[PDB]
């Protein structure tokens, strides 16, 4: 259930992120994540391209994700 969606085509993920401890709050039309369809809202975002958000300040992780936009590989723990 800890899926590792890696779908992407370089040029937007199309998601929103909430922090409690970081998970997917919404999926928006037209983005890479929406195209894949598997990372449902509420799934926890565990890893992005082998970078783990564990302990890492939610902001630092968010900035990292900002920085990544090469291909984006998301590891999510589906509810």
Author numbering: 264 to 274, 277 to 285, 293 to 341, 345 to 354
The authors write:
The PDZ domain of Dishevelled2 (Dvl2PDZ) binds and activates WGEF by releasing it from its autoinhibitory state. Using biochemical and molecular dynamics studies, we show that a unique “internal-PDZ binding motif” (IPM) of WGEF mediates the WGEF-Dvl2PDZ interaction to activate the GEF.
The only hit, 349-GSTFSLWQDIP-359 (hereafter referred to as WGEFpep), obtained from the sequence search, lies between the DH and the inhibitory domain of hWGEF. Despite extensive efforts, crystallization trials met with no success. Hence, we resorted to crystallizing the WGEFpep (peptide) in complex with Dvl2PDZ. Furthermore, we tried to obtain the WGEFpep–Dvl2PDZ complex structure by fusing the peptide with the C-terminus of the PDZ domain. Due to the lack of structural information on the WGEFpep–Dvl2PDZ complex, their binding mode has remained unclear. It is interesting to note that the affinities of WGEFpep and N3pep are nearly identical for Dvl2PDZ, with dissociation constants (Kd) of 45 ± 5 and 54 ± 7 µM, respectively. Furthermore, the substitution of tryptophan (WGEFpepW7A), aspartate (WGEFpepD9A) and proline (WGEFpepP11A) residues at the P−2, P0 and P2 positions, respectively, with alanine completely abolishes the WGEF–Dvl2PDZ interactions. Compared to the other known Dvl2PDZ–internal peptide interactions, in the WGEF-Dvl2PDZ complex, only five residues at the P2, P0, P−1, P−2 and P−3 positions appear to contribute significantly in stabilizing their interactions.
